[PDB]
From a paper:
We found that while Rv1045 encodes the guanylyltransferase TglT (unusual type guanylyltransferase-like toxin), which arrests bacterial growth, Rv1044 encodes the atypical protein kinase TakA (unusual type of atypical kinase antitoxin), which neutralizes the activity of TglT via phosphorylation. It encompasses an N-terminal domain (NTD) and a C-terminal domain (CTD). The NTD (1-181aa) exhibits an α/β fold that commonly found in nucleotidyltransferase-like proteins. A large central cavity is formed between NTD and CTD.
To shed lights on the origin of TglT phosphorylation, we determined the crystal structures of a selection of mutants, S78A, D82A and E146Q. On the contrary, while no electron density was observed for S78 phosphorylation in the crystal structure of TglT mutant E146Q expressed alone, we observed clear electron density for a phosphate group connected with residue S78 side chain in the TglT mutant E146Q structure co-expressed with TakA, resembling the structure of the wildtype TglT. Surprisingly, mutant E146Q (motif 2a) exhibited toxicity similar to the wildtype protein. We next compared the initial growth rates of E146Q, D82A and wildtype TglT, which revealed a clear difference 4 hours after induction. While the growth rate of D82A exhibited negligible differences from the plasmid control, the growth rate of E146Q was significantly lower. Thus, E146Q mutation on motif 2a led to attenuated toxicity rather than complete loss of function. The E146Q mutant exhibited toxicity similar to the wildtype TglT, which was rescued by TakA.
Author numbering: 3 to 292
The structure:
Amino acid sequence: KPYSSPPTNLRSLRDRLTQVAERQGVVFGRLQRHVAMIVVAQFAATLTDDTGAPLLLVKGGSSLELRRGIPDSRTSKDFDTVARRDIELIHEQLADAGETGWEGFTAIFTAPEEIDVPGMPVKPRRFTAKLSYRGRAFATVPIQVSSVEAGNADQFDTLTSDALGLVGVPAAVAVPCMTIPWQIAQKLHAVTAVLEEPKVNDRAHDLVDLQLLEGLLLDADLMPTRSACIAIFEARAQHPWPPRVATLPHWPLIYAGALEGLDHLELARTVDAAAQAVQRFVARIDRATK
Ligand SMILES: [Mg+2]
Ligand SMILES: [Mg+2]
Ligand SMILES: [Mg+2]
Ligand SMILES: [Mg+2]
Ligand SMILES: [Mg+2]
Ligand SMILES: [Mg+2]
Ligand SMILES: [Mg+2]
Ligand SMILES: [Mg+2]
Ligand SMILES: [Mg+2]
Ligand SMILES: [Mg+2]
Ligand SMILES: [Mg+2]
Ligand SMILES: [Mg+2]
Ligand SMILES: [Mg+2]
């Protein structure tokens, strides 16, 4: 019943995925995106400095999915990361890793392009991983890489997933991730940011993720989070800490979209209530002292 040998080919891989997905009550494409992200994460985890410490830390929706599992996280499409080396090093090192492969998977990477960002001195980079399994195209993963901000690569959490185990690929999964205080600081900054009026802030989904991150801090001391929030807001030199969690007129349905699949969790059910919850979190962070 549990596969004793790895999938012999793509078709066998897809067949085992659909079985696992049906078995777990998960959408096939969701499980497939998760497995592909994991494979890319394993490539990224081979990138170390000359002391063996990670060069790339995972963040964003991939991190939340690793922290909470598929049933308890938003569907997201990006593999978002933070690097401690230049993009040119990162892209070249990833391409090598993807050529060497991992457990039958290989990847080729499109070229990095810069993206518009006002608070980062170094512009983020974005490209794509074309994944294959035993020679045959398998999946596409959008990748984003941003440079360090303040202390947000000083430490990392190491998370895992058994999804590849469940389809007969047993090699341990271990993914270095940006820690929760920095995920909170960056999402709080993004969800409260005011953009230039050609552009509009659509990040209502960050209100969902911020509730999930507050839940994951449990009763932790908030002081590291407060320090991280201060550091990110001062570093970006835009709106000041503590921000106001405002809602824009088009956010009600975006927030509703972001709740898809999470009916079983205790989340704010309306964007107003979500803004109120995250504002209370902001105040709670700001109160921290010891
Ligand atoms: Mg096949
Ligand atoms: Mg299914
Ligand atoms: Mg390092
Ligand atoms: Mg994800
Ligand atoms: Mg992903
Ligand atoms: Mg710092
Ligand atoms: Mg193992
Ligand atoms: Mg705003
Ligand atoms: Mg609504
Ligand atoms: Mg969403
Ligand atoms: Mg729901
Ligand atoms: Mg609820
Ligand atoms: Mg409130």
